[PDB]
mmCIF file with all atom_site columns, N, CA and C and ligand atoms in Angstrom:
data_model
loop_
_atom_site.group_PDB
_atom_site.id
_atom_site.type_symbol
_atom_site.label_atom_id
_atom_site.label_alt_id
_atom_site.label_comp_id
_atom_site.label_asym_id
_atom_site.label_entity_id
_atom_site.label_seq_id
_atom_site.pdbx_PDB_ins_code
_atom_site.Cartn_x
_atom_site.Cartn_y
_atom_site.Cartn_z
_atom_site.occupancy
_atom_site.B_iso_or_equiv
_atom_site.pdbx_formal_charge
_atom_site.auth_seq_id
_atom_site.auth_comp_id
_atom_site.auth_asym_id
_atom_site.auth_atom_id
_atom_site.pdbx_PDB_model_num
ATOM   1   N  N   . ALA A 1 1  ? 44.130 184.719 15.289 1.00 18.60 ? 1   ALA A N   1
ATOM   2   C  CA  . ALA A 1 1  ? 44.054 183.287 15.543 1.00 18.60 ? 1   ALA A CA  1
ATOM   3   C  C   . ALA A 1 1  ? 45.170 182.560 14.814 1.00 18.60 ? 1   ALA A C   1
ATOM   4   N  N   . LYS A 1 2  ? 45.446 181.353 15.288 1.00 18.47 ? 2   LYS A N   1
ATOM   5   C  CA  . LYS A 1 2  ? 46.372 180.442 14.650 1.00 18.47 ? 2   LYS A CA  1
ATOM   6   C  C   . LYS A 1 2  ? 45.647 179.166 14.264 1.00 18.47 ? 2   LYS A C   1
ATOM   7   N  N   . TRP A 1 3  ? 46.112 178.569 13.177 1.00 17.89 ? 3   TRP A N   1
ATOM   8   C  CA  . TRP A 1 3  ? 45.518 177.375 12.608 1.00 17.89 ? 3   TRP A CA  1
ATOM   9   C  C   . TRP A 1 3  ? 46.641 176.434 12.223 1.00 17.89 ? 3   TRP A C   1
ATOM   10  N  N   . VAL A 1 4  ? 46.519 175.161 12.584 1.00 15.95 ? 4   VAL A N   1
ATOM   11  C  CA  . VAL A 1 4  ? 47.576 174.202 12.295 1.00 15.95 ? 4   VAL A CA  1
ATOM   12  C  C   . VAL A 1 4  ? 47.197 173.324 11.131 1.00 15.95 ? 4   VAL A C   1
ATOM   13  N  N   . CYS A 1 5  ? 48.182 173.074 10.283 1.00 18.01 ? 5   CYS A N   1
ATOM   14  C  CA  . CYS A 1 5  ? 48.055 172.089 9.227  1.00 18.01 ? 5   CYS A CA  1
ATOM   15  C  C   . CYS A 1 5  ? 48.201 170.706 9.842  1.00 18.01 ? 5   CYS A C   1
ATOM   16  N  N   . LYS A 1 6  ? 47.123 169.937 9.782  1.00 17.48 ? 6   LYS A N   1
ATOM   17  C  CA  . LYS A 1 6  ? 47.103 168.621 10.415 1.00 17.48 ? 6   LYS A CA  1
ATOM   18  C  C   . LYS A 1 6  ? 48.026 167.628 9.713  1.00 17.48 ? 6   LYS A C   1
ATOM   19  N  N   . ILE A 1 7  ? 48.490 167.970 8.512  1.00 16.93 ? 7   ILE A N   1
ATOM   20  C  CA  . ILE A 1 7  ? 49.402 167.111 7.786  1.00 16.93 ? 7   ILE A CA  1
ATOM   21  C  C   . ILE A 1 7  ? 50.856 167.301 8.222  1.00 16.93 ? 7   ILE A C   1
ATOM   22  N  N   . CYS A 1 8  ? 51.339 168.541 8.204  1.00 13.35 ? 8   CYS A N   1
ATOM   23  C  CA  . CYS A 1 8  ? 52.773 168.796 8.404  1.00 13.35 ? 8   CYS A CA  1
ATOM   24  C  C   . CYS A 1 8  ? 53.204 169.601 9.636  1.00 13.35 ? 8   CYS A C   1
ATOM   25  N  N   . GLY A 1 9  ? 52.254 170.183 10.349 1.00 9.23  ? 9   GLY A N   1
ATOM   26  C  CA  . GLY A 1 9  ? 52.563 170.967 11.534 1.00 9.23  ? 9   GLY A CA  1
ATOM   27  C  C   . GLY A 1 9  ? 52.825 172.428 11.264 1.00 9.23  ? 9   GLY A C   1
ATOM   28  N  N   . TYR A 1 10 ? 52.689 172.867 10.012 1.00 11.11 ? 10  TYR A N   1
ATOM   29  C  CA  . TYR A 1 10 ? 52.762 174.299 9.734  1.00 11.11 ? 10  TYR A CA  1
ATOM   30  C  C   . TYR A 1 10 ? 51.639 175.019 10.473 1.00 11.11 ? 10  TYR A C   1
ATOM   31  N  N   . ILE A 1 11 ? 51.946 176.199 11.000 1.00 11.72 ? 11  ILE A N   1
ATOM   32  C  CA  . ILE A 1 11 ? 50.956 177.031 11.676 1.00 11.72 ? 11  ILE A CA  1
ATOM   33  C  C   . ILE A 1 11 ? 50.641 178.248 10.811 1.00 11.72 ? 11  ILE A C   1
ATOM   34  N  N   . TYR A 1 12 ? 49.383 178.386 10.405 1.00 10.38 ? 12  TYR A N   1
ATOM   35  C  CA  . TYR A 1 12 ? 48.950 179.627 9.780  1.00 10.38 ? 12  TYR A CA  1
ATOM   36  C  C   . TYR A 1 12 ? 48.597 180.595 10.905 1.00 10.38 ? 12  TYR A C   1
ATOM   37  N  N   . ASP A 1 13 ? 49.369 181.663 10.975 1.00 13.81 ? 13  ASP A N   1
ATOM   38  C  CA  . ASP A 1 13 ? 49.137 182.715 11.931 1.00 13.81 ? 13  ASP A CA  1
ATOM   39  C  C   . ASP A 1 13 ? 48.564 183.895 11.188 1.00 13.81 ? 13  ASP A C   1
ATOM   40  N  N   . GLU A 1 14 ? 47.361 184.272 11.581 1.00 12.27 ? 14  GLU A N   1
ATOM   41  C  CA  . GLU A 1 14 ? 46.657 185.363 10.919 1.00 12.27 ? 14  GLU A CA  1
ATOM   42  C  C   . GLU A 1 14 ? 47.411 186.689 11.063 1.00 12.27 ? 14  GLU A C   1
ATOM   43  N  N   . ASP A 1 15 ? 48.151 186.856 12.151 1.00 11.71 ? 15  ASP A N   1
ATOM   44  C  CA  . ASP A 1 15 ? 48.921 188.081 12.352 1.00 11.71 ? 15  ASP A CA  1
ATOM   45  C  C   . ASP A 1 15 ? 50.102 188.200 11.378 1.00 11.71 ? 15  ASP A C   1
ATOM   46  N  N   . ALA A 1 16 ? 50.573 187.058 10.888 1.00 10.75 ? 16  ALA A N   1
ATOM   47  C  CA  . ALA A 1 16 ? 51.691 187.001 9.952  1.00 10.75 ? 16  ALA A CA  1
ATOM   48  C  C   . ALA A 1 16 ? 51.227 186.965 8.495  1.00 10.75 ? 16  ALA A C   1
ATOM   49  N  N   . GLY A 1 17 ? 50.082 186.335 8.243  1.00 8.98  ? 17  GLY A N   1
ATOM   50  C  CA  . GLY A 1 17 ? 49.630 186.138 6.883  1.00 8.98  ? 17  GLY A CA  1
ATOM   51  C  C   . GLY A 1 17 ? 50.570 185.147 6.211  1.00 8.98  ? 17  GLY A C   1
ATOM   52  N  N   . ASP A 1 18 ? 50.757 185.315 4.909  1.00 13.27 ? 18  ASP A N   1
ATOM   53  C  CA  . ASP A 1 18 ? 51.570 184.403 4.081  1.00 13.27 ? 18  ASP A CA  1
ATOM   54  C  C   . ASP A 1 18 ? 51.967 185.205 2.852  1.00 13.27 ? 18  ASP A C   1
ATOM   55  N  N   . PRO A 1 19 ? 52.751 186.271 3.081  1.00 12.75 ? 19  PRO A N   1
ATOM   56  C  CA  . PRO A 1 19 ? 52.942 187.273 2.027  1.00 12.75 ? 19  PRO A CA  1
ATOM   57  C  C   . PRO A 1 19 ? 53.598 186.721 0.782  1.00 12.75 ? 19  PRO A C   1
ATOM   58  N  N   . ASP A 1 20 ? 54.490 185.759 0.960  1.00 14.27 ? 20  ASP A N   1
ATOM   59  C  CA  . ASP A 1 20 ? 55.182 185.174 -0.169 1.00 14.27 ? 20  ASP A CA  1
ATOM   60  C  C   . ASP A 1 20 ? 54.215 184.483 -1.123 1.00 14.27 ? 20  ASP A C   1
ATOM   61  N  N   . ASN A 1 21 ? 52.999 184.229 -0.650 1.00 10.60 ? 21  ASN A N   1
ATOM   62  C  CA  . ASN A 1 21 ? 51.983 183.591 -1.464 1.00 10.60 ? 21  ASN A CA  1
ATOM   63  C  C   . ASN A 1 21 ? 50.735 184.458 -1.592 1.00 10.60 ? 21  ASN A C   1
ATOM   64  N  N   . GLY A 1 22 ? 50.940 185.769 -1.507 1.00 12.04 ? 22  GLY A N   1
ATOM   65  C  CA  . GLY A 1 22 ? 49.906 186.738 -1.802 1.00 12.04 ? 22  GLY A CA  1
ATOM   66  C  C   . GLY A 1 22 ? 48.939 187.056 -0.681 1.00 12.04 ? 22  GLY A C   1
ATOM   67  N  N   . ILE A 1 23 ? 49.337 186.764 0.547  1.00 13.80 ? 23  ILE A N   1
ATOM   68  C  CA  . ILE A 1 23 ? 48.461 186.964 1.703  1.00 13.80 ? 23  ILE A CA  1
ATOM   69  C  C   . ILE A 1 23 ? 49.100 187.936 2.677  1.00 13.80 ? 23  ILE A C   1
ATOM   70  N  N   . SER A 1 24 ? 48.503 189.116 2.800  1.00 18.22 ? 24  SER A N   1
ATOM   71  C  CA  . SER A 1 24 ? 49.055 190.154 3.658  1.00 18.22 ? 24  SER A CA  1
ATOM   72  C  C   . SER A 1 24 ? 48.761 189.851 5.127  1.00 18.22 ? 24  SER A C   1
ATOM   73  N  N   . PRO A 1 25 ? 49.600 190.361 6.044  1.00 18.12 ? 25  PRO A N   1
ATOM   74  C  CA  . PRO A 1 25 ? 49.349 190.158 7.473  1.00 18.12 ? 25  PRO A CA  1
ATOM   75  C  C   . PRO A 1 25 ? 47.961 190.639 7.885  1.00 18.12 ? 25  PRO A C   1
ATOM   76  N  N   . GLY A 1 26 ? 47.319 189.905 8.786  1.00 21.99 ? 26  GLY A N   1
ATOM   77  C  CA  . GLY A 1 26 ? 46.009 190.265 9.294  1.00 21.99 ? 26  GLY A CA  1
ATOM   78  C  C   . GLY A 1 26 ? 44.884 189.647 8.504  1.00 21.99 ? 26  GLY A C   1
ATOM   79  N  N   . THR A 1 27 ? 45.234 188.757 7.592  1.00 20.71 ? 27  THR A N   1
ATOM   80  C  CA  . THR A 1 27 ? 44.228 188.049 6.827  1.00 20.71 ? 27  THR A CA  1
ATOM   81  C  C   . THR A 1 27 ? 43.705 186.832 7.599  1.00 20.71 ? 27  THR A C   1
ATOM   82  N  N   . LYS A 1 28 ? 42.396 186.815 7.845  1.00 22.11 ? 28  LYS A N   1
ATOM   83  C  CA  . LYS A 1 28 ? 41.760 185.715 8.571  1.00 22.11 ? 28  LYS A CA  1
ATOM   84  C  C   . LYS A 1 28 ? 41.774 184.441 7.723  1.00 22.11 ? 28  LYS A C   1
ATOM   85  N  N   . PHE A 1 29 ? 41.855 183.285 8.378  1.00 19.17 ? 29  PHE A N   1
ATOM   86  C  CA  . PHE A 1 29 ? 41.852 182.021 7.659  1.00 19.17 ? 29  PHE A CA  1
ATOM   87  C  C   . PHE A 1 29 ? 40.640 181.933 6.732  1.00 19.17 ? 29  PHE A C   1
ATOM   88  N  N   . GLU A 1 30 ? 39.464 182.284 7.242  1.00 18.17 ? 30  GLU A N   1
ATOM   89  C  CA  . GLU A 1 30 ? 38.243 182.209 6.455  1.00 18.17 ? 30  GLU A CA  1
ATOM   90  C  C   . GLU A 1 30 ? 38.246 183.143 5.235  1.00 18.17 ? 30  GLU A C   1
ATOM   91  N  N   . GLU A 1 31 ? 39.165 184.111 5.209  1.00 17.83 ? 31  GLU A N   1
ATOM   92  C  CA  . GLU A 1 31 ? 39.300 185.022 4.063  1.00 17.83 ? 31  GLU A CA  1
ATOM   93  C  C   . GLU A 1 31 ? 40.311 184.555 3.037  1.00 17.83 ? 31  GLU A C   1
ATOM   94  N  N   . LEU A 1 32 ? 41.053 183.503 3.358  1.00 17.88 ? 32  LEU A N   1
ATOM   95  C  CA  . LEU A 1 32 ? 42.017 182.973 2.418  1.00 17.88 ? 32  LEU A CA  1
ATOM   96  C  C   . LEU A 1 32 ? 41.257 182.482 1.185  1.00 17.88 ? 32  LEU A C   1
ATOM   97  N  N   . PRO A 1 33 ? 41.850 182.652 -0.001 1.00 17.38 ? 33  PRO A N   1
ATOM   98  C  CA  . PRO A 1 33 ? 41.216 182.187 -1.229 1.00 17.38 ? 33  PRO A CA  1
ATOM   99  C  C   . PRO A 1 33 ? 40.950 180.697 -1.172 1.00 17.38 ? 33  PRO A C   1
ATOM   100 N  N   . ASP A 1 34 ? 39.945 180.251 -1.918 1.00 16.70 ? 34  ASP A N   1
ATOM   101 C  CA  . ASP A 1 34 ? 39.596 178.844 -1.937 1.00 16.70 ? 34  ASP A CA  1
ATOM   102 C  C   . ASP A 1 34 ? 40.759 177.998 -2.429 1.00 16.70 ? 34  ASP A C   1
ATOM   103 N  N   . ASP A 1 35 ? 41.607 178.571 -3.282 1.00 16.10 ? 35  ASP A N   1
ATOM   104 C  CA  . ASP A 1 35 ? 42.734 177.815 -3.847 1.00 16.10 ? 35  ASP A CA  1
ATOM   105 C  C   . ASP A 1 35 ? 44.052 177.947 -3.066 1.00 16.10 ? 35  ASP A C   1
ATOM   106 N  N   . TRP A 1 36 ? 44.001 178.543 -1.878 1.00 13.17 ? 36  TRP A N   1
ATOM   107 C  CA  . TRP A 1 36 ? 45.175 178.639 -1.023 1.00 13.17 ? 36  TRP A CA  1
ATOM   108 C  C   . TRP A 1 36 ? 45.418 177.278 -0.397 1.00 13.17 ? 36  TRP A C   1
ATOM   109 N  N   . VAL A 1 37 ? 46.689 176.917 -0.304 1.00 12.82 ? 37  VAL A N   1
ATOM   110 C  CA  . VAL A 1 37 ? 47.082 175.643 0.289  1.00 12.82 ? 37  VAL A CA  1
ATOM   111 C  C   . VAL A 1 37 ? 48.254 175.851 1.227  1.00 12.82 ? 37  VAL A C   1
ATOM   112 N  N   . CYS A 1 38 ? 48.484 174.880 2.102  1.00 9.97  ? 38  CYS A N   1
ATOM   113 C  CA  . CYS A 1 38 ? 49.593 174.934 3.013  1.00 9.97  ? 38  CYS A CA  1
ATOM   114 C  C   . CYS A 1 38 ? 50.902 175.136 2.242  1.00 9.97  ? 38  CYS A C   1
ATOM   115 N  N   . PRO A 1 39 ? 51.651 176.205 2.573  1.00 10.14 ? 39  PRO A N   1
ATOM   116 C  CA  . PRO A 1 39 ? 52.852 176.529 1.799  1.00 10.14 ? 39  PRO A CA  1
ATOM   117 C  C   . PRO A 1 39 ? 53.961 175.485 1.942  1.00 10.14 ? 39  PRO A C   1
ATOM   118 N  N   . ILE A 1 40 ? 53.863 174.658 2.969  1.00 9.35  ? 40  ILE A N   1
ATOM   119 C  CA  . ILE A 1 40 ? 54.867 173.630 3.210  1.00 9.35  ? 40  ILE A CA  1
ATOM   120 C  C   . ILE A 1 40 ? 54.531 172.331 2.479  1.00 9.35  ? 40  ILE A C   1
ATOM   121 N  N   . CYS A 1 41 ? 53.353 171.776 2.751  1.00 10.27 ? 41  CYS A N   1
ATOM   122 C  CA  . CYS A 1 41 ? 53.006 170.442 2.235  1.00 10.27 ? 41  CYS A CA  1
ATOM   123 C  C   . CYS A 1 41 ? 51.931 170.387 1.156  1.00 10.27 ? 41  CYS A C   1
ATOM   124 N  N   . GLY A 1 42 ? 51.335 171.519 0.838  1.00 6.87  ? 42  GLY A N   1
ATOM   125 C  CA  . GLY A 1 42 ? 50.338 171.565 -0.220 1.00 6.87  ? 42  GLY A CA  1
ATOM   126 C  C   . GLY A 1 42 ? 48.926 171.143 0.153  1.00 6.87  ? 42  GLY A C   1
ATOM   127 N  N   . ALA A 1 43 ? 48.674 170.925 1.441  1.00 10.61 ? 43  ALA A N   1
ATOM   128 C  CA  . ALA A 1 43 ? 47.350 170.484 1.883  1.00 10.61 ? 43  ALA A CA  1
ATOM   129 C  C   . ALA A 1 43 ? 46.288 171.555 1.682  1.00 10.61 ? 43  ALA A C   1
ATOM   130 N  N   . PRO A 1 44 ? 45.086 171.149 1.250  1.00 11.26 ? 44  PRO A N   1
ATOM   131 C  CA  . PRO A 1 44 ? 43.977 172.106 1.176  1.00 11.26 ? 44  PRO A CA  1
ATOM   132 C  C   . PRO A 1 44 ? 43.543 172.635 2.524  1.00 11.26 ? 44  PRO A C   1
ATOM   133 N  N   . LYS A 1 45 ? 42.796 173.725 2.467  1.00 8.28  ? 45  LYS A N   1
ATOM   134 C  CA  . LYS A 1 45 ? 42.269 174.352 3.671  1.00 8.28  ? 45  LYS A CA  1
ATOM   135 C  C   . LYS A 1 45 ? 41.518 173.381 4.578  1.00 8.28  ? 45  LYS A C   1
ATOM   136 N  N   . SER A 1 46 ? 40.847 172.393 3.989  1.00 11.21 ? 46  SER A N   1
ATOM   137 C  CA  . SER A 1 46 ? 40.089 171.422 4.764  1.00 11.21 ? 46  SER A CA  1
ATOM   138 C  C   . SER A 1 46 ? 40.924 170.729 5.835  1.00 11.21 ? 46  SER A C   1
ATOM   139 N  N   . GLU A 1 47 ? 42.245 170.687 5.663  1.00 10.32 ? 47  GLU A N   1
ATOM   140 C  CA  . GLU A 1 47 ? 43.105 169.927 6.579  1.00 10.32 ? 47  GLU A CA  1
ATOM   141 C  C   . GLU A 1 47 ? 43.693 170.756 7.724  1.00 10.32 ? 47  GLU A C   1
ATOM   142 N  N   . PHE A 1 48 ? 43.188 171.974 7.890  1.00 6.31  ? 48  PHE A N   1
ATOM   143 C  CA  . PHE A 1 48 ? 43.609 172.841 8.987  1.00 6.31  ? 48  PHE A CA  1
ATOM   144 C  C   . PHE A 1 48 ? 42.627 172.827 10.120 1.00 6.31  ? 48  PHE A C   1
ATOM   145 N  N   . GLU A 1 49 ? 43.164 172.979 11.320 1.00 6.85  ? 49  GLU A N   1
ATOM   146 C  CA  . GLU A 1 49 ? 42.343 173.101 12.507 1.00 6.85  ? 49  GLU A CA  1
ATOM   147 C  C   . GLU A 1 49 ? 42.700 174.340 13.307 1.00 6.85  ? 49  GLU A C   1
ATOM   148 N  N   . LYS A 1 50 ? 41.682 175.044 13.781 1.00 6.27  ? 50  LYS A N   1
ATOM   149 C  CA  . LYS A 1 50 ? 41.908 176.247 14.572 1.00 6.27  ? 50  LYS A CA  1
ATOM   150 C  C   . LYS A 1 50 ? 42.399 175.875 15.979 1.00 6.27  ? 50  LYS A C   1
ATOM   151 N  N   . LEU A 1 51 ? 43.430 176.565 16.448 1.00 4.95  ? 51  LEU A N   1
ATOM   152 C  CA  . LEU A 1 51 ? 44.015 176.289 17.768 1.00 4.95  ? 51  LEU A CA  1
ATOM   153 C  C   . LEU A 1 51 ? 43.307 177.066 18.885 1.00 4.95  ? 51  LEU A C   1
HETATM 154 FE FE1 . FE  B 2 .  ? 51.018 171.321 5.747  1.00 2.00  ? 101 FE  B FE1 1
#
């Protein structure tokens, strides 16, 4: 799945993960740590929407 940051337009793609911030490819959004934030704008998880 993909999830968009409603603040900046960054797309969290589960197939890509976010390795530079400790998230390996294939990590589901719901599995992201509670303290993970948008790598671009710093928004909390609450500000993402599933596409
Ligand atoms: Fe963002």
